[PDB]
Structures are given as C-alpha cells and as structure tokens.
C-alpha cells in the first residue's frame, strides 16, 4: 500500500496558509526518491533527517501539511524563524524533524487582475505554538479596549488577502508548500521508506 502523498502534492486546490491542511499518513510504504530527485521543486530542505536516508527509515506517523504563501515568505517555513507567517499562521518547532518542499505556482494560483482568494492572518494576540492551527475570525483587540465583536478603532479583522497577479515579482508570486513531519513515538512504526 503506497503512501498517498500524491493527493497532497498533486491536489488541484491548495488552502490558505492560515487554514493550512494536514493529512495523516500511516500504515504504508513510500519511495521518497520520487520527491527529492524531482526537478519540480524550488525548495527541498530537510531538518534532523537527510533526504537521502528517508528510504532507510520507518516512523510511527508522518504528517503532510500544505498551504500557499508568497515566494519571499518560504524562508519563514523553517525552525527558529519569525514573521507574520511563522508567528501567526504556520510555526515549525526548534527540534523539527522533517522536510519543507515548495514550488512556484504562479500558473495555477494567479489571475490576470489579481487572485484574491488566498489569505493569511495579519494580526494575533500571541504567536502560534508549533503546528498550531487558528482559523478563527474574531476581531483582533489591538489595544486595551474590548472590541465586543465589533470592527472599529483598535479592533481589526484579523485576516488579509494576498494579491497574486501574474506580473508580480517572483518574491510576490504564489508558492505551494508541503511540510513533511516524521514522528517516532514510543509506539510501533507504521510508515517505512523504500
């Protein structure tokens, strides 16, 4: 039973980074050379594990997280980073064991005159914990006065839309990202590389 990484990387629709998706992959085998020997990725960087050793290892569980961000924000998808994405949208732990994979998706996620459907969280009271998801749309209390659910002074809607236009510079183009987390708990391994 081949691991279903295909329906993550080749999915037709990707989610907004604030509402990043997660697929739990278990009880399967996979040849990871299909990924790290692919010419389709502009970023393929692993932490705590070398890509060329993935096929020698088994893990209790593997998570595959996916989302869309800007090109010059792919740097934030790494351990120990800061910024609106790492702080408020998708946060990797310091001791991350996994791989970050990204590729330019201007042809799929942009529209002449702007694609506006991809969003990110711009305001948040605190930084996300590692691997935390926050999809709430409560009004952000920028000051000390309660907002009571009302947009106004010091009370901001927390989400902001990317403006993905084909003519944007590369740093402002959309990039699809897949984060693979390899976890080894005190429990039977079930996901093995080949």
């Amino acid at each position, epitope marked *: 039973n081949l691991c279903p990484f295909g329906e993550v990387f080749n999915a037709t629709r990707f989610p907004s980074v604030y509402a990043w998706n997660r697929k739990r992959i278990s009880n399967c085998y996979y040849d990871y050379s299909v990924l790290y020997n692919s010419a389709s990725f502009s970023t393929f960087k692993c932490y705590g594990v070398s890509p060329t050793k993935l096929n020698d290892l088994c893990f209790t569980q593997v998570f595959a997280d996916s989302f869309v961000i800007r090109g010059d924000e792919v740097r934030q998808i790494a351990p120990g980073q800061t910024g609106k994405i790492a702080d408020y949208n998708y946060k990797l732990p310091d001791d991350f064991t996994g791989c970050v994979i990204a590729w330019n998706s201007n042809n799929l996620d942009s529209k002449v*005159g*702007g694609n506006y459907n991809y969003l990110y969280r711009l*305001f948040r009271k605190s930084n996300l914990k590692p691997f935390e998801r926050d999809t709430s749309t409560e*009004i952000y209390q920028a000051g000390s006065t309660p907002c009571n659910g009302v*947009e106004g*002074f010091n009370c901001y809607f927390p989400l*902001q*839309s990317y403006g993905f236009q084909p003519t944007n510079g590369v740093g402002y183009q959309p990039y699809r990202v897949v984060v693979l987390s390899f976890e080894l708990l005190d429990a039977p391994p079930t996901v093995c590389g080949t």
Partner: single-chain antibody
Amino acid sequence: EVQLVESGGGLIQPGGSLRLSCAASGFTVSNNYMSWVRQAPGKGLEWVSVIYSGGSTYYADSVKGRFTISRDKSKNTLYLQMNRLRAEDTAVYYCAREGEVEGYNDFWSGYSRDRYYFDYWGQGTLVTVSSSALTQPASVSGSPGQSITISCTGTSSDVGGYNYVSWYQQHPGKAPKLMIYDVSNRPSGVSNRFSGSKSGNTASLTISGLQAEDEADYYCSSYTSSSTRVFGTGTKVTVLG
C-alpha cells in the same frame, strides 16, 4: 497601480433606485476600508458610507435605511445601492479607499487598520434625481508667494478626540486629492509647501509660497468616535492676481 473606476450614474425619478459600481485594480477591495463620498452641485463633500475588511458597514444618518454599501470580491468591485431616492441625493458620487495596513512604504509604522485618510479616489459619477460637518471658513485668499492658513473646528468626538485629521485639495471637475494625513504628515509627492497642525478641537492647513495652481477647494476630514468619517464645509482658496 491603484485605480478606482466608477459607473452607473444617471438621471432617475424621485423614489426610484440605482446601483453605482466602483471597479478597483492594483489592490483588493477587502484589504482596505472602502467609502462612498458624495458632493451636491456647488456644495461640499459628504461622507455617506464605509465597508470594513470584515464586512462591517457604517452609514451617515442622511442615507440610513435607504443606501446599502457592499462589495463583490470575485469582481473586485464596490457597490452603492441607492433606494428611495430624493432630489437631495443629486450629487457626484465618489468611491474612496483608505490607507494600507503598513501605511506608507517609506516609513516604518507597523501594521494597523487605523489608517483614516482617503489616499485614492474614483473619478466620480453624477446621479441626478429629478421629477454634521466640521467648520471651515468659506473663503481664504493670499498673494502669490505668500502663506495662508485654513482652520477646521470639530469636537471631542472627532478632530479633538483623535490625531486622524486629513486634508484634501479639489480642482474644478476633478476628484479630491489627499494632501495631509494624520494631522501633520505629507504623502510622498506632495509639495513641502503644505503643512498641517492641530490644537484642541481645531486643525489647521497652511499653504506657503502660494502658486496659481493652489487655487482650489480644500476640505478637512476626521475619524469620529462613531466609526464614521466627517468632512469640513470646505474652503475656497483664491490666489490674488
């Protein structure tokens, strides 16, 4: 390249309905607070409605229960539905955008949606229906190369409650142009001859080295404690000679 292009104006009978459109480009209509501002023939600017990033809408009492502001994000378009129309609604209608979350790119001020100044305007569309305000002096004049000052009194609830006073220049037949924001700040590209200040409930615009091109109508505007906006009555600046 930010642009706001309006359409839908026309002559309609009292009691009729009309929908105005404001097609935006260069930015996402949901990423900025969008307002409609109208101007009756020969009169001053009147703010009437705004829509916030989360969809919240606020209205001037003069249009409550009759006008509805909305947007279509797929069309990047802002709308004003005008029902139960009155002859007093005859005016040029402008759509206007408020500031970017980052403010201006040449100065670090963090991120905030408290950016209360109309930095980009549509060209205006006239609606003819045919079968309050901050205090400004009616007219001010000065000699070429000299300085004049324009006052703008409000209340604890707007000019004197916040440092969110902005000033606009309007030539005949043209949309207003932002000259000063946040009381004393100048956008890039606006002449250093324009400056702004405030004391108590009165804001002031000073134009130095007056030139013939400075002849125009000038309006102040303020955020209000009701999350609305309010324009001054307008000042006609005359450059002698």
